[PDB]
C-alpha cells in the first residue's frame, strides 16, 4: 500500500508549551482519549442545519484545531523514535491508541517541548512493522501537516487528468448523489482512515475526482448547466443555509478535459474557514486523497507563514513545486454568483441580490470569530480560535487566480 | 403577598446551606440577573 508520511508539528505562535491543557484529552468525542479517527466524530449524528459548536469549542474547525496541537504534543515517534510523555500523558503501547496517564514502574522519558518538529515516519520502525493496525494515524498526521503548513486555512490539493473520468469512477460516484459536501467530507475521511488502501484504488481516484469536481461548483464553473461528467453541486440561497451543496446528477452540456494537468494546491486565506462547515469539509475532503497518496509534488514557498519556510519534504522552492492559489470565501462566492448570471441561471437582479445576502452571512462569520478570539486570547493556554488578527477578514489575495484556475480546469 | 402572590422571579440554584435559609426575603443581590455576563436565555421553543 503506502508507508512514508512526512509530517510537521503545529506552530506555537510564540507561546511556551503547545496550545492545549490536560482537559482536552478527556473531552474528545468518540473513543476516549484516542485522537486518531476523531475529527468528524462530533458530527456522527445530525440533528439539524445549525453548526455544532459549544462553549470551549467556539467554532466548526475548533474541534480539529485543538486535536492538532494535542496531536503534535505527543508525536516524538517518527521524529525521535522514543515515545516520551507530555505533562504525565503517554500512549498505551507501540500501536499508539488512546492516551493514558504515564504508567508507573517504567515511565517514558519527558518530551522536550519544541516548535515545528519535522516528522520522518521511517524513524519509527514499529510503524511499518504494524501498518494494518496503526493506519489511521497516517491519515491524521497528514491532516495536521496540511493544517500546520498554513496560518490561514488548510492547504489541500486539486488535480484532474488530461483525459475524461475512468469507467470505474463514473460507476462508483453514482452513489453519493443526495449527499451534502459536509457529509462527503465525513465519508471521504472515514474511508482513508481505517484500512491501508492503494494509491490506484477505485475509491481513491473517485474521491479525488469528487473533490476537484466540488471546486468547480464552489467557483461556479461547474453549475447546473455545466457538469464535469454529469456531476455538480446545486447551491441554495445564502440567506437560507449556504452550507448545503449535494452532488446532483444531470444530463446537460458537459465541459471538456483540459489540455494539461491542473495540479494545484488551494488555501482559504480568510479566517472565515474556521466557522464554515462547508470550507472545513472541502479542505478535509481533499486531504483524504493526499493521505493514501503522498503529496504529488512540493508546495510553493511563495507566501505561506514564516515557519513553513523550506520544510524537509513538504514545502520547497525549486522547480519541483506546485503553486498554491489561495482565495477568500466572500470574493469567491461573489465571483461564484457572477458565473451563474453569465450563463443565465439567475437574473441580473439576483446578481447583486445574492451578494448582499451572502456578504451579510459572511459578516456573521466575522462578527463571531472576532468575538471569540477576544473571549479566548492565546496566552491563556489553549488555541480553539487560532490568532488571526482583525486586520484581515477582507484582504483577498489571488482569489482571482483561483477562479481562473477553475476556468482552465474545465474548458 | 398578603393574598398569596409573590412578585419578581424565581431562582433555581442548588444552595445547600446550614444557616437561616430565607426563600422569601432574600438577603444580598440575586445571583445572575437577566442579560448579565454569560447568562443566555432559552429560545422560545426550548428545544434541546
Amino acid at each position: 500500500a503506502q508507508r512514508q508520511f512526512f509530517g510537521l508539528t503545529y506552530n506555537f505562535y510564540g507561546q511556551p508549551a503547545p496550545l492545549f491543557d490536560l482537559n482536552d484529552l478527556q473531552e474528545l468525542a468518540g473513543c476516549y482519549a484516542r485522537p486518531w479517527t476523531s475529527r468528524f466524530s462530533h458530527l456522527a449524528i445530525s440533528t439539524g442545519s445549525l453548526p455544532v459548536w459549544s462553549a470551549r469549542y467556539p467554532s466548526v474547525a475548533s474541534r480539529n484545531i485543538v486535536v492538532n496541537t494535542l496531536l503534535g504534543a505527543h508525536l516524538n515517534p517518527f521524529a525521535g523514535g522514543q515515545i516520551t510523555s507530555h505533562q504525565g500523558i503517554t500512549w498505551r503501547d507501540p500501536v499508539l491508541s488512546s492516551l493514558a496517564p504515564v504508567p508507573a514502574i517504567q515511565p517514558p522519558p519527558v518530551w522536550a517541548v519544541a516548535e515545528n518538529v519535522l516528522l520522518d515516519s521511517n524513524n519509527y520502525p514499529t510503524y511499518v512493522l504494524n501498518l494494518s493496525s496503526m493506519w489511521p494515524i497516517n491519515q491524521d498526521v497528514h491532516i495536521m501537516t496540511m493544517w500546520a503548513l498554513s496560518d490561514q486555512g488548510p492547504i489541500y490539493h486539486l488535480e484532474v487528468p488530461v483525459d475524461p473520468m475512468p469507467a470505474a469512477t463514473t460507476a462508483a460516484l453514482m452513489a453519493y448523489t443526495g449527499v451534502p459536501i459536509a457529509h462527503l467530507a465525513q465519508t471521504a475521511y472515514r474511508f482513508a482512515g481505517q484500512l491501508p488502501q492503494s494509491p490506484d484504488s477505485t475509491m481513491v481516484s473517485t474521491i479525488r475526482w469528487l473533490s476537484a469536481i466540488w471546486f468547480g461548483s464552489l467557483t461556479g464553473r461547474l453549475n447546473r448547466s455545466r457538469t464535469c461528467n454529469g456531476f455538480y453541486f446545486e447551491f441554495a440561497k445564502p440567506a437560507l443555509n449556504p452550507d448545503q451543496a449535494v452532488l446532483k446528477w444531470n444530463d446537460g452540456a458537459r465541459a471538456a478535459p483540459p489540455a494539461a494537468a491542473q495540479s494545484s494546491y488551494i488555501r482559504c486565506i480568510s479566517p472565515h474557514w474556521q466557522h464554515q462547515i462547508v470550507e472545513v469539509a472541502g479542505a478535509l475532503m481533499s486531504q483524504s486523497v493526499t493521505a493514501v497518496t503522498g503529496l504529488p509534488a512540493l508546495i510553493d514557498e511563495a507566501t505561506l507563514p514564516a515557519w513553513s519556510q523550506g520544510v524537509a519534504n513538504l514545502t520547497g522552492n525549486g522547480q519541483g513545486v506546485v503553486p498554491c492559489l489561495d482565495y477568500n470565501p466572500v470574493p469567491m462566492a461573489a465571483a461564484r454568483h457572477l458565473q451563474w448570471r453569465q450563463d443565465g441561471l439567475i437574473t441580473a437582479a439576483q446578481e447583486a441580490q445574492l451578494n448582499n445576502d451572502y456578504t451579510a452571512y459572511a459578516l456573521t462569520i466575522e462578527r463571531h470569530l472576532t468575538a471569540m478570539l477576544v473571549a479566548n486570547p492565546i496566552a491563556a493556554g489553549r488555541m480553539p480560535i487560532q490568532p488571526f488578527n482583525a486586520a484581515d477578514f477582507g484582504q483577498a489575495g489571488q482569489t482571482a487566480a483561483a477562479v481562473a484556475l477553475a476556468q482552465a480546469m474545465f474548458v | 403577598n398578603l393574598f398569596n402572590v409573590a412578585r419578581g422571579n424565581l431562582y433555581l440554584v442548588q444552595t445547600a446551606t446550614n444557616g437561616n435559609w430565607s426563600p422569601m426575603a432574600p438577603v444580598a443581590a440575586p445571583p445572575f440577573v437577566r442579560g448579565g455576563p454569560n447568562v443566555r436565555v432559552v429560545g422560545r421553543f426550548g428545544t434541546i
Binding site: 475512468p166 469507467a167 470505474a168 462508483a172 452513489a175 477505485t202 | 422560545r44 426550548g46
Partner: protein
C-alpha cells in the same frame, strides 16, 4: 470476446461494450445501504 473482463489482461474495471456486445464477466459494484427512518421530538412555540 464475451469475457474481456475475466480473460483479457487489458480490462478496465467498469468498462462495458454495451451498445455492441453483451459482456458476461464484468465488475459490478455491490452496495450496502441502510435506510434511516427518522422519529424525533417536536416542540411547539409557547404562548409568548
Amino acid at each position: 470476446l464475451r469475457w474481456p473482463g475475466l480473460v483479457d489482461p487489458n480490462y478496465r474495471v467498469g468498462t462495458n461494450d454495451l451498445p455492441n456486445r453483451i459482456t458476461l464477466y464484468n465488475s459490478l459494484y455491490r452496495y450496502n445501504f441502510t435506510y434511516p427512518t427518522l422519529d424525533g421530538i417536536m416542540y411547539v412555540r409557547s404562548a409568548t
